[PDB]
Design a binder for this molecule. Structure first.
Ligand SMILES: [Zn+2]
Ligand SMILES: [Zn+2]
Ligand SMILES: [Zn+2]
Ligand SMILES: [Zn+2]
Lengths: 160, 160
């Protein structure tokens, strides 16, 4: 179902990011700040080997904890293997490198109950064009919850 | 901003309904089952005087409570006055009476922070055409959360 980006240069996604919008196939995955896949991406750090370190924050033990996820390169381009969040795959759908990035996470064992997708942006501002790209990519996908954040929320993102 | 239905026959909306989809301007209004405006419409009972009794269920005191809301007719058609859920207005946007109904609730004091909208259906089944009408009506509105329920969830709707 999912169509991944072709000709992705992973080195060009490095730097600071913000989670502008999130979507998921199951409401329980994103509803409430303490939900399993409610994650806020803060930085993408690609490696020389072609892997992707994802820095993000997540609600745990009563507060916003900082997590580092190592996404390993696989034989399929724009698809990375992870062992976190009960997910095993990160899929980069699209990016223009300097404004927005669209990606999804899933578990290959049950991809319909585990699919979460995000729209990332470089600056803590609403990019209507990025949201349009996000919505278009989501049309084919069976999403039952969609969240969209404003500039004020994008500053600290996760907060007690 | 909101455009209400013209030529609404309120008597024809009587009977059983299900909340298929919900949307709101603020995430806090709908995120989590215990959220202030997470409400599940079960029945619409119009009166001979032209008022609308809304039967719905809402999470309160650890369980799904049953609520009856009286929507009073106002001088503007398809717009009803209420005194519940911290809202004071019910706006009927569109309906075909026998399959779907779209409505919004708001507080006139702060309509941007209080707007919640729903897509109702007669039967506990996903109507892709009703969702299309819902999405089109929402385009102009500043929604930051969207929820969509499946047939299994639509049977009991709210549940412990
Ligand atoms: Zn590696
Ligand atoms: Zn589905
Ligand atoms: Zn009356
Ligand atoms: Zn807004």
């Amino acid at each position: 179902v999912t169509q991944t980006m072709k000709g992705l240069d992973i080195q060009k996604v490095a730097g600071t990011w913000y989670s502008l919008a999130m979507a998921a196939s199951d409401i329980s995955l994103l509803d409430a700040q303490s939900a399993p896949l409610r994650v806020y991406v803060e930085e993408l750090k690609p490696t020389p080997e072609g892997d992707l370190e994802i820095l993000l924050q997540k609600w745990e033990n009563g507060e916003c904890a900082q997590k580092k996820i190592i996404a390993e390169k696989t034989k399929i381009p724009a698809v990375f293997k992870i062992d976190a969040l009960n997910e095993n795959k990160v899929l980069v759908l699209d990016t223009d490198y300097k404004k927005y990035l669209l990606f999804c996470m899933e578990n290959s064992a049950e991809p319909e109950q585990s699919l979460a997708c995000q729209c990332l942006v470089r600056t803590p501002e609403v990019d209507d064009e990025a949201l349009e790209k996000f919505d278009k990519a989501l049309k084919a996908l069976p999403m039952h919850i969609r969240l969209s954040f404003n500039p004020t929320q994008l500053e600290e993102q996760c907060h007690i």
